[PDB]
Amino acid sequence: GSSGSSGMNSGRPETMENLPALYTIFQGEVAMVTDYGAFIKIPGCRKQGLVHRTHMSSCRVDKPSEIVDVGDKVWVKLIGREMKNDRIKVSLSMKVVNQGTGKDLDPNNVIIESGPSSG
């Protein structure tokens, strides 16, 4: 059989570190829709993340306010989480996460990084 530990710490309280880990995949619902992205609510958290229009959809995005709507549940993956004593910023992506199963589509996490490219 496979030798290895499964779990030692069961159940977790509500601490400042409620948000998911980096590059973590989860299912959330849209709470706000903007022409520059949409806000998603994470299950078992305190803060919400924003999904830029560029990430809202891989292909060209002209009207992100038509792609999603408050009440719709979709799969998102954390691309960048920053917590400051002055403010907390959370960035989520969808163009790198499926909508039928929620499986990771970009296990590389290179696109999320502002890199050089053609056209």
Distance, CA of 88 to CA of 30 (rounded, Å): 19
Report if residue 112 sits inside a domain: no
Report if residue 76 sits inside a domain: yes
CA R_g for the chain: 16
Strands 88-93 and 37-41: unpaired
Task: Decide if 28 contacts 40 (C-beta within 8 A).
Answer: yes
Task: Decide if 23 contacts 109 (C-beta within 8 A).
Answer: yes
Q: Residue 61 is part of which domain span?
A: 15-106
Report if residue 22 sits inside a domain: yes
Distance, CA of 100 to CA of 64 (rounded, Å): 19
Number of domains in the chain: 1
Report if residue 46 sits inside a domain: yes
CB burial of 6-38 (b: ≥16 within 10 Å; e: otherwise) equals: eeeeeeeeeeeeebbeebebbebebeebeeebb
Amino acid letter at 91? S
Report if residue 1 sits inside a domain: no
**Residue labelled with tokens 């570190």:** 17
Distance, CA of 66 to CA of 90 (rounded, Å): 23
Report if residue 2 sits inside a domain: no
Task: Decide if 66 contacts 48 (C-beta within 8 A).
Answer: no
Task: Write the DSSP string, 29-86.
Answer: EEEEEETTEEEEE-TT-SS-EEEEHHHH-SS--S-TTTT--TT-EEEEEEEEEEE-SS
Distance, CA of 38 to CA of 29 (rounded, Å): 10
Report if residue 6 sits inside a domain: no
Report if residue 5 sits inside a domain: no
- CATH number, domain of 19, equals 2.40.50.140
Query: Determination technique for this PDB entry?
Result: NMR
Amino acid letter at 104? D
SS3 content of the chain, % helix, strand, coil (to 5): 5, 30, 65
